[PDB]
Amino acid sequence: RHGVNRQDTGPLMKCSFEETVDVLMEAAAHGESDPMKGVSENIMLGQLAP
Amino acid sequence: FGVLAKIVNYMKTRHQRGDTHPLTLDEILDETQHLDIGLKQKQWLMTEALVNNPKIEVIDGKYAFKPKYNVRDKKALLRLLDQHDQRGLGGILLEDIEEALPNSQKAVKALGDQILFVNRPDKKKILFFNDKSCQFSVDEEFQKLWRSVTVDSMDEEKIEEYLKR
């Protein structure tokens, strides 16, 4: 849990794994941008996964 | 003490009646119906209630005027008001009525001259006070006024900035 979150991947991926609210609060607070490049973000969003 | 309060109350009524003429203790005992209060209490009266009394007025070798000592002029505080720093004095309506004459008769004339009534000693209670310059703009006034409470809502040194630009 505490290692996967150090990865420079988009915030929405990290929410999909155990951290839920907390990673989103920090993502909102820093104002990071999620490039929808990975498998999970695309499936959650509903558009055809890469 | 209770007996002494009846002396105070009698004296209070007499002041209220308009007179402050002094009387002997014996007469006061009589008029208060406390003649048979005994030598001891009388002596207590003489050597405390009448002499250790912080606001007793001795005049004509007799004791007068107990209820009041703070005010004697029995008139509007023109001197108190004239000052620009020590101005003032919200006072109790019952104090003004007790001091000399009932307020209401002078007040009906005074109500558009020198007196102002605010509800403050409870909403039933009334305080007396006074005024000076006009209102600024004829208008419904209460409607415009209620749309003018400014904006005590921030970014206001910036709303004057914005307003100046």
Partner: protein, 222 residues
Amino acid sequence: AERGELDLTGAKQNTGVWLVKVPKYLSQQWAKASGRGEVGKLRIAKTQGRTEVSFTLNEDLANEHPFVLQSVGGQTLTVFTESSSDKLSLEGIVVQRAECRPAASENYMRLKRLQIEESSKPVRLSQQLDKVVTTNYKPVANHQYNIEYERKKKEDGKRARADKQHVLDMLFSAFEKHQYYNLKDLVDITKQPVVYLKEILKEIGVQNVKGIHKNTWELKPE
């Protein structure tokens, strides 16, 4: 306080006494004698390397208890007395402890079991009920409530108010006892409507409150 003095005569005489364990049932049989004289006799039999001590009951009171001696080398025991006259004395010293062993064995037990019946037997649940309804034997006018109305039925619900000046006298009298009073004490003291008394306290006094609405009134002593 001489009452707190402990007499040492006994101790200084080196008076010795015996300490014996005997069953409550043996002492209950002894209680029938009621101190009229004796409860029986004690016998001591000594042989080549043995001592046999026993007590035997009076033939009369009955109309062998062997003794077992215990060690007292590891403790000191003394007897001190407490008089009804509020005086304390060490009457003497315990030199020996012992226990009284019952001669009868297994049938004694029946007596014991009978004794067990005597100590242990208030009925526990036990007989149930076959009956049911009794309750609410109709008061139609509740019995306490009737009594309270009866108390009311002796000149109540009317107050002086009306005698103003005499009521003022009560106020003046009361105020002579203390500088301030609770409204509730004045209501008990003058037996009049509260609102009227308030108009009087407005007339000749002020009020002074503290804590949780705890109010006391005073005729402004000076």
